[PDB]
Design a protein around this nucleic acid. Structure first.
Length: 173
DNA sequence: CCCGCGAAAAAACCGCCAAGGGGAAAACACCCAAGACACCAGGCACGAGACAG
């Protein structure tokens, strides 16, 4: 804080709409902060960084976990973000239902009303996954797909099955 | 039906295979396995309980 104050005392600072710090990502793997912009999102990592325009997004999927304790937030990309010799077709995020948050936008009330048409507010609070879903919806306009009318025998909304030498969850959307 | 329907001499220009299907070698990528890098979250240590004792 002292260094920041010393910097501000000499600089003339004039941005991101909202910044989520450290969100459990599964594809790619690791903790990544997410900065929101009017036309894209900056996925900042401890080493690698990516920038996904909203024009590249195709679908947003919000799925529950088999144990009913976690939430999967999937973003379908196009073109896929590239990293050396690998291309990711989906951005997967993992959240916990008991992981709340309180966010405040970097905009004013009237500007938010004009931009998001009242879909968002200057200050919000609620579950982390709910907040991310609401923000991404208000940004992309695409509706977030949710599980259908399927309910497995174990009461879960998916089936545990293998695929390409790897276990995982299959959701009938 | 078969066969014939004059001796010839000179010149010129046009006629100059193309496809469908089978096979060989090559790359072209899928699948599988193993190593090395980023990192993150799980154990250890410490404070601060607090709650039975």
């Amino acid at each position: 804080e002292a260094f920041a104050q010393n910097v501000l005392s000499k600089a003339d600072v004039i941005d991101a709409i909202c910044i989520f710090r450290e969100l459990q990502c599964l594809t790619p793997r690791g903790r990544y902060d997410i900065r929101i912009y009017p036309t894209f999102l900056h996925l900042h990592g401890k080493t690698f960084d990516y920038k996904i325009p909203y024009t590249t997004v195709l679908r947003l999927f919000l799925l529950p976990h088999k144990d009913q304790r976690q939430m999967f937030f999937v973003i379908s990309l196009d073109p896929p973000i590239k990293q050396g010799q690998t291309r990711y077709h989906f951005l997967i995020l993992l959240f916990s239902k008991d992981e709340d948050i309180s966010l405040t936008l970097n905009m004013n009330e009237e500007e938010v009303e004009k931009r998001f048409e009242g879909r968002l507010t200057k200050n919000m609070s609620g579950s982390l996954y709910e907040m991310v879903s609401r923000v991404m919806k208000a940004l992309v306009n695409r509706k977030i797909t949710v599980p259908g009318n399927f309910q497995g025998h174990s009461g879960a909304q998916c089936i545990t099955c293998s695929y390409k030498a790897s276990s995982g969850l299959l959701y009938p959307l």
